[PDB]
Structure formats: structure tokens, C-alpha cells
Design a protein around this ligand. Structure first.
Ligand SMILES: *C=C1C(=O)CC(c2cccs2)CC1=O
Length: 122
């Protein structure tokens, strides 16, 4: 509805220059944390909004563990599907530690971006 404001993403809220410097600050103060931005897919109609956007994830945590953490934050029940996507592909099947996902998939600004949805392609 045009009466209600559109959802604005992290990259629309913070400029690239600010994001680049945020990550430099984060990396300096927390070298063992991965800076992750987790957002709901723009067209999502079945899953609620997350109470935070930026997560400093310990670098040993794997993707299966992170998925459980987000499902819990969203208070999902077991009959609700949830997919976590990085750069256009699903992280749902894997046990890769997030440290490795960061090196493979991080944005130019230094953040690792993830999108969640109730479907795997859209
Ligand atoms: C939103 C967060 C938290 O609630 C705590 C997380 C921590 C993980 C290990 C030590 S603190 C960081 C975070 O982004």
C-alpha cells in the first residue's frame, strides 16, 4: 500500500563509505567476529521481520548453526520453512564455518550479506 512506507535495506540506510568504515572498525575491535547483515527478502509474505540487522558472528560458527539461531530469533515453529541465501544461492544444506563463507562471499564493503525467505528461488 502506498499509504505505508516502503521497507528500506541496510545499503539504503548507510552509504558505501560508511559501511566500509564500519567494517574496518568492527574488524579492528573484533578480529574473531564476522560482520553479517541479515535481511528479509523484499517480497516475503510468510516470515516475520528480524529484531536486528547487523550480527557479529563468531568465526567458528557454521551455517547450520546460524540457521538455527535465526529461526529461533524469528520464533518460528517447525512447520515454517526458512531459507538463508548468500549471493543468490542457498546456505541451507551446509556445515561450512562462516569464516570461509566470509572469504568467499563478502561484499566489497566488507559485510557478508544474507537474505532469508520462505522459498529458495524467487
Ligand atoms: C546481536 C549480537 C548478539 O546478541 C551477541 C553476539 C555475540 C556473540 C558472541 C559474543 S557476543 C553479537 C551480536 O551481533
Amino acid at each position: 500500500s502506498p499509504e505505508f512506507p516502503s521497507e528500506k535495506t541496510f545499503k539504503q540506510r548507510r552509504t558505501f563509505e560508511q559501511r566500509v568504515e564500519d567494517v574496518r572498525l568492527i574488524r579492528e575491535q573484533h578480529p574473531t567476529k564476522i560482520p553479517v547483515i541479515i535481511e528479509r527478502y523484499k517480497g516475503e509474505k510468510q516470515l516475520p521481520v528480524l529484531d536486528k540487522t547487523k550480527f557479529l558472528v563468531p568465526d567458528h560458527v557454521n551455517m547450520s548453526e546460524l540457521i538455527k539461531i535465526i529461526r529461533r530469533r524469528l520464533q518460528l515453529n517447525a512447520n515454517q520453512a526458512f531459507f538463508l541465501l548468500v549471493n543468490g544461492h542457498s546456505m541451507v544444506s551446509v556445515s561450512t564455518p562462516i569464516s570461509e563463507v566470509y572469504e568467499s562471499e563478502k561484499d566489497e564493503d566488507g559485510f557478508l550479506y544474507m537474505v532469508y525467505a520462505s522459498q529458495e528461488t524467487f
